[PDB]
Amino acid sequence: DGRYSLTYIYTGLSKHVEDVPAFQALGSLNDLQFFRYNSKDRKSQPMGLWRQVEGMEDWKQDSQLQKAREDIFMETLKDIVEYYKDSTGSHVLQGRFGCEIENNRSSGAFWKYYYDGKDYIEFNKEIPAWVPFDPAAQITKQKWEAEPVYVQRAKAYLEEECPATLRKYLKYSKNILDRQDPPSVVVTSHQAPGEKKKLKCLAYDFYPGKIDVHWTRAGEVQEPELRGDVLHNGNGTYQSWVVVAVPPQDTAPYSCHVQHSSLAQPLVVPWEA
């Protein structure tokens, strides 16, 4: 077994402007986002490759849960703004929570909020109790700990529920998170009217993202003039490119090299002028 992480991020705005939802939520499994929800549509929607997954989650019921989450989250923001007596201002509360497993064993958990970018309050499950960092968080803490069962529920969420949810999602996400998709490569060249000729090597449609792409000139690894990459969440694939400029009078042999975890050995793709 390897490392898997489940992370949720909530963002609330006390005075949202036109076309920006007051509350937005997203969730990621490792490097991929699997769902989103906002206060405009009010629907939890799967994303990327999870749009094709069936039976992992009942999105209609999750929608109801997120609405309840949104309500409490925004009330928390409202209370903070009230404490500072600044509702005419535009403020933001962001919360991050989730857990991780490694070798099928819980290996980490976190739950922390930030107000206007500064640490606000976080849960320490070993105590177990909330830890305030901002003066207003002392009030929030008092409310979140008004009955003995509240900290017990918070501890159970990080230690029992969240990892159970991750394990479940992993059962339906094997063909997504554990893929070893080999890269397709395409070499191409371009001539800028007046500038040198440049050779572009592109590796695409691969996963995971870790990859080694480099050009060689007569077997000599070259220094790229421009390099870049991207992750397309819709597809769950990466693309990575490298570019070199070639002397107007160079005849040497150019070849692109690609090494990736899904390949039995590296690939070489020479460029034919």
Ligand X SMILES: *[C@@H]1O[C@H](CO)[C@@H](O[C@@H]2O[C@H](CO)[C@@H](O)[C@H](O)[C@H]2NC(C)=O)[C@H](O)[C@H]1NC(C)=O
CB 163 to ligand NAG: min, Å = 9
Residue 104 interacts with ligand NAG (CB under 6 A): yes or no: yes
- Shortest distance, CB of residue 235 to ligand X, whole angstroms? 3
Q: Which is nearer to ligand NAG, 167 or 214 (CB)?
A: 167
Q: Using CB atoms, what's the residue nearest to ligand X?
A: 235
Q: Which helix (H) or strand (E) holds 242?
A: strand 237-246
Q: Element (H or E) spanning 172, and its range?
A: helix 162-172
Q: Residue 262: helix, strand or coil by DSSP? A: coil
Smallest separation (angstroms) from ligand X to the CB of 208: 15
- DSSP code for 14: S
Binding partner selected for residue 232 from ligand X, ligand NAG, none, CB under the kind-specific 5 to 8 Å limit: ligand X
240 makes contact with ligand X (CB under 6 A): no
Which one of ligand X, ligand NAG, none interacts with residue 237, CB within 5 to 8 A by kind?
A: ligand X
CB-based contacts of 216, cutoff 8 Å, min separation 6: 222, 254, 255, 256, 257
DSSP string, 248-273: TT--SPEEEEEEETT-SS-EEEE---
Interface with ligand X (CB under 6 A), residue total 6
Of 120-128, 142-150, 160-168, 234-242, the window that binds ligand X (rule: CB under 6 A) is 234-242
Residue 235, SS3 per DSSP? coil
Interface residue with ligand X among 190, 196, 210, 232 (CB under 6 A) is 232
Distance CA 231, CA 209 (A): 8
Say whether residue 7 binds ligand X (CB under 6 A). Answer: no
Binding status of residue 184 toward ligand X by CB under 6 A: no
> Residues 205, 225, 229, 250: which binds ligand X (CB under 6 A)?
205
Cα distance between residue 164 and residue 104, in whole Å? 11
Q: Which of residues 28-87 bind ligand NAG (CB under 6 A)?
A: none
| Rg of the chain taking only CA atoms, in angstroms | 24
Give the number of residues written for the chain. 273
State whether residue 87 is helix, strand or coil.
Answer: coil
Assess 239 for contact with ligand X (CB under 6 A).
yes
16 binds, among ligand NAG, ligand X, none (CB under 5 to 8 A by kind): none
Residues 6+ apart with CB under 8 A from 219: 253
Q: Which residues contact ligand NAG (rule: CB under 6 A)?
A: 104, 167
